[PDB]
Write the structure tokens for this entry.
Amino acid sequence: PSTSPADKDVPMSILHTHGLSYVNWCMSLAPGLLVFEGFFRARYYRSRVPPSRTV
Amino acid sequence: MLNSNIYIIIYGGIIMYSIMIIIQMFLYNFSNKIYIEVEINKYILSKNNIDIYWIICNCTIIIIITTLNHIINKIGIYNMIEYNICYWLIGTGLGLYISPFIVFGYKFFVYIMDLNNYSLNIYHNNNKMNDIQQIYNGTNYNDTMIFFIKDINNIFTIYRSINFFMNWLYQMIYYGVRMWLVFVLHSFSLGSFGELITVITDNNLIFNVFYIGLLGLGFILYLIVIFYLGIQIYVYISFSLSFLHSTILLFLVNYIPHYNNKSIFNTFTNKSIY
Amino acid sequence: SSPLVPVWNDLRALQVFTSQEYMQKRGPGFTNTLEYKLSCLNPVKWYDMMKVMPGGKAFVGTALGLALFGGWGVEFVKNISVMTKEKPPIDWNNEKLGHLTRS
Amino acid sequence: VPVANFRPKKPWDGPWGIQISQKKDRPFIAMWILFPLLLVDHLTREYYAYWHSSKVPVTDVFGDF
Amino acid sequence: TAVVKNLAKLPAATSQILTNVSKLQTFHGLLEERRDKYAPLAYHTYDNLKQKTTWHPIAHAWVDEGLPVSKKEYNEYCWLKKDMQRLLPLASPFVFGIYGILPLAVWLSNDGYLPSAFSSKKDIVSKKLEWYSSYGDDLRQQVGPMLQHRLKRHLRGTLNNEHRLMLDEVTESYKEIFYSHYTGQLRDVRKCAHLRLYDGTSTVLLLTNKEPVELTSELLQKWNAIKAAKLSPEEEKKARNEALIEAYKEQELHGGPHVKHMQGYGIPADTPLLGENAKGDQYTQPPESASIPLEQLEWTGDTVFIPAEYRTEMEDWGRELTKLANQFLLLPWRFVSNAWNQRRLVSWFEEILQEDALIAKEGGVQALSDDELKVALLDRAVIRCDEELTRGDMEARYKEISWLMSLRNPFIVLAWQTGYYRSTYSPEDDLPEASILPKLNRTVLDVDVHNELAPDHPEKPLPRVHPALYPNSHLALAKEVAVLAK
Amino acid sequence: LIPVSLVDLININIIFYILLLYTLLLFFIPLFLASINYTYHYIYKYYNYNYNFINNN
Amino acid sequence: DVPIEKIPEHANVLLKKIDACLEILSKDIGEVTDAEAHEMYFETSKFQILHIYTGCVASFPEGDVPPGAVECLPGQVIRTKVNGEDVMLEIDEVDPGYQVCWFKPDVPLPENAEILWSYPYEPTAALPTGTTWEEGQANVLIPAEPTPEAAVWPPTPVT
Amino acid sequence: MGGKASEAVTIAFRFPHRTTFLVKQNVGQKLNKGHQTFWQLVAGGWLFFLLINRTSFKPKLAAPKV
Ligand SMILES: CCCCCCCCCCCCO[C@@H]1O[C@H](CO)[C@@H](O[C@H]2O[C@H](CO)[C@@H](O)[C@H](O)[C@H]2O)[C@H](O)[C@H]1O
């Protein structure tokens, strides 16, 4: 039948994490999101020009 | 007990990961539609264009969506799904394989069942003996005492009919395996180089610094990954459709010239004579 | 595909047009021969000339040929790599196990 | 006398356009409910097996066991 | 409800059902007795792919010109055939079991699913009109537009290939036929006949003892003249063969029949002599009939109709267009091949032609009542019951579709019919306002059939000329004038 | 390597992925078709039947 | 039952109707001018927005920048108040051999500098007044917007 | 591996013949049809074949005689 063993329930803590290297973080592609969010937002909201007066 | 035959199914995270792939299709809104329209109108002209077009659109957009979720939305299955062979053989290749058999399946089936009655194709077949051989003997060839070996003949003729539908399967499998190998090996090699560099820098902490930069390296690797995978996806699509043309769609070339009509306002009928 | 395709096409055209040349040479009178009168009563000829008929009769003939003879052909192809192989003696059933009085 | 090729609406004319819009924007609404649910489903998840695990979670689908 | 309301009359309906079956059996016996001695044999023919039969009205829809039958009796025949079609759910308990009664209950729920016996009316015309106004016009009004769209998209093709598939000379006629619900202007049937330009020239090869000959208007005129002269057969056959050899020489000077240079058709040349059978320069072997002298040219009595429909043919229509045409004509369509639905459509077409012949024998449209003409137009599928047209408009509509169906082409027939089923609904209550002009009225005179109309050039449409403005119009329309004034 | 495996060739988990994906695709097809083209607006605006009248004089 | 003289009455009715239609349909909605709809056009500029309400803006030849002056390159957005009107100025096509900078009062101006526009001294003021561009100080160009000829349908002649 | 469409004939080369509707004059060939009692005897033979090949299920053979 359905089961829910206690082996899956284990302690958890962020202190025990090995973590990532600088290279793995660069390969995680977060910095690309960081740049390209602003890029695409800028392109979209800059395509639509408002009216103006030339001084 | 004896009658109990038990089977184990390995079930994981499927529902919530598969829902967002279809939900994203409203956002993408078939951006590849123009490209696939151009290619389909290059390769074939028939009333059933829209069918195959829509099919290819669905397949390609699913590929694109999965790839982008594999690059960006990294959770659970979205990472493995492009590194797995089952996805590359059944989730992308099988649909493209069965698409022409689902659009022009009537014509292909009739063609195959006519090719089981194997015969020599004559251009400008104004011959009479060809017709008598085809009706009386069944074929142009000599069919004397082939019933003696009919058991193999059936299946061999079946293969003889589908031999010109088999290279499509071969090319689909080949390019699916190619994409799987490309993704897997490039990811593995890149990660291996990363780990060796980190071992060198961990053993030499004068170098364990953001030596290229926090964003420079990441942006460059992002561009490298996306450029390479975009090239690979464009290759897999362009080649899939060009080989679809050159292998399956040249069968359906039926050019009808336009003949001017003259008897518009009057038609001869059975009552005109009888 | 191979580059011998035009060679095979030439040979096929050779045999086909030579058979037609033979039929032209012998001319009429084939219906009076004994071969024709037997082919009229031969089921191989009936099946072979029904195959090329319209109305799905090509599919019918092919599927009938499959269902009848192609299964034995598949078994034959499977047994080609079995004929040369060492096999054990057949454990023939003693036909003793199964009998049981009714109650 | 009325104008031709005009008539009152019927049930087989389908829903109105505003109703079709309300049908269209329901996936877009459920998006906001499901993407956070996706993130929560991933974050509040626990692995199912370990090197020490003597048992594995079983889910009898039809209650045959 | 209607279930119990129809169950109340279910006992009284079986006797009427059996009486109708007896009438149908007698009528079919009579009709087939006439058909088996006056009608030719239309052989079965298979489509381009040679797997399923194909059907065309020119060969299969025969009209018994001289049928001793009343128009109402033929209406009874067709309506009872449809009732036999509607009686099919009675087989569900005899194939599924005692639980196959719920399908019969669903059958008995709606009165439109049912045959004549469950109706309170008595006359066949009133009964048919009740059935139409209750169920049939509504079912047709929700298939008409989508069938019109399928016909459009069958001509113009799919996926932006109009520059490769459409013709630039039929463009204005196409627009006038398919977009007249935008303008509100009436349509000319000749502009719908212009759609046949997508097809080739329809030919008729008469088979002789030597060669086939293409039929022409001249040869047909001569044969009709000889048939009208009522001569002895020894002179009739002689004159026929004289005209036949004359036409043979004419086409031999023209360059052979039209079929020789048409893709998909062709006449073989003399057979070749292979190898040593070739006797020097004579590489050919003429047929046996080459020995026969040309003066003995006689018609075998065999004919070959070739519509040459390269874009219009019912084979290339598809799984959907045929089903929708049968829905629009209220025919059976579910779970059958396009060949069987084609035959059903051709049988309906033949029925309409025979009904036209019987009306012309009975004195045209004006001899009919208002309800009878309404029911006829409903059968022809050119009127919807939410219109309330005039008698002259109804007669003109009938004449239009009668001439159009005389050409024996279902595609243009459906293109014409679907134009009368494009109705809209407004979102506001005040709009559309009550009109100020009277209802649209016409006459049989307004229909121009006796005059040719060239296809209007693209983006250069021409106005419509009334037939009355033509010269000698009072002479040409004198029959219709006498019929209307009388 | 992990993906080099015969177990991952006929993975039932990915087969369930494909099943759910295309069932939802089938469910949401009629919403993907709900994009409007402006071609019949053009045809209504630009289609002009000949409105000139006949005048024998 | 419809004489020919009664037609022009119907024509008058339909002319009245279509004129009541066209007098409405002749109107059209112009471009939107709400700043809330276009604030992200300024948010996404290549430079941060300068909320300038004090000091002066000056043009001076290219070279060394005075320390303390805020450069105003092409693409620079400046929120100001001009003659009581809250406005955004986007710099476009600064002339060559010259550059423009915001000089706060703490910053001394260099030689050969030209004050393009200046602000008054109002430290106690909560709502600043901004500037006052006099005639000759700034050449403001209104777009001409030449309304072309109204599209008239050709009347066909009737002899 | 395998062939291509470029290496084979088309679905228009095969099945190149469009449709032609043959018609033949009525001389009286489908008249005076004999064997008026053919289908009655055919149905009788069919029912006879079904009766000889009929087998009712007799569960009484499974009765507990023992
Ligand atoms: C134009 C460029 C030409 C040179 C081509 C160079 C080859 C480039 C191959 C790009 C494809 C590699 O594909 C990429 O692999 C990396 C490395 O595992 C994956 O990266 C992932 O795994 C690594 C391995 O440790 C983790 O550290 C990282 O956090 C995670 O994102 C990316 O998710 C995947 O997108």
Notes: The CA atoms of residues 130 and 263 of chain B lie 36 Å apart. Residues A 24, 27-29; B 71, 186-187, 190-191, 194, 224-225, 227-228 surround dodecyl-beta-D-maltoside (CB under 6 Å).
